[PDB]
Symmetry: C2
Subunit: 138 residues, 2 copies
């Protein structure tokens, strides 16, 4: 799915960044169990969409819109993980894969509601903080 | 997405059925806001998939498999609706659309949990009863599948010793006090069962028949 794929690509990139890593197409490939030609196919579309630029050093620099989208997707991913552990009580071992799905179908409206209902949205159950809360308007 | 389109088509047929409407393609197309030609291509694709048959009247009859799936999708959809209003507090005017997306991503694991965390899952906030709860287990899973590579504790739903030809481990099980209703640690390694200090590494046939459900 075009958007879901792109949303996944940008979240992955965002993570690499978080990990102190350089977002390289090869990294995304092996991180997304992806085939190089495929990552190129996708990044290429993403580039035409103005979401990412492959720096002259062959690294991936997310354009401002790209980064805003990556952050939104990460925010939703983490608010999903919070709901899943805090409220639903889903197995901690199942929380991440479930959240990677929900990140594509959770609306901003649900996010704001969770910001209001969750006890703490500072960080995900996994230790990383929840980005973009300000941009959400919460 | 082929899967998501099918789930959506199946849930749509379920709603028309539930509304007392005939599941006709023109109806589904109107509902889904898709052209009749598209729904035709999708339903044909679903027939080859054995999910539906176009009856005499040109109505769509869901085969037992299509109905089982339609029911599951309608179940996640409504449980998502109860989660959205009962807990998240999402504007009632936005609960339907949100649920129609969430129905495709919610795992059964999340459903069994919601059933435990929600106050009442009889019907949706929209009046319709929540289907397939019995089939959600809210029998079990053949321990061969459920047996995770991680030593997890579960609950014996059924032993199925009547279908068993190899009675070798019948006492092995009794000795380890492993019976229906027993919480036992299962893990993939051959599959071993664990209870009352005694372990029971099962063989193929017993693995395919002992059915466990999450505690």
């Amino acid at each position: 799915d075009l958007v879901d794929t792109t949303e996944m690509y940008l979240r992955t990139i965002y993570e690499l960044e978080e990990e102190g890593v350089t977002p390289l197409r090869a990294r995304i490939a092996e991180r997304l169990e992806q085939s190089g030609p495929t990552v190129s196919q996708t990044v290429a579309r993403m580039e035409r969409d103005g979401l990412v630029v492959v720096a002259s050093d062959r690294s991936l620099q997310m354009t401002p819109t790209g980064r805003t989208l990556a952050t939104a997707v990460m925010r939703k991913h983490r608010l999903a993980e919070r709901l899943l552990t805090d409220i639903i009580g889903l197995d901690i071992n199942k929380v991440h894969d479930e959240a990677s799905r929900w990140e594509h179908v959770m609306s901003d409206e649900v996010e704001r509601r969770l910001v209001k209902v969750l006890k703490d949205v500072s960080r995900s159950p996994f230790g990383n903080p929840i980005p973009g809360l300000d941009e959400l308007g919460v």
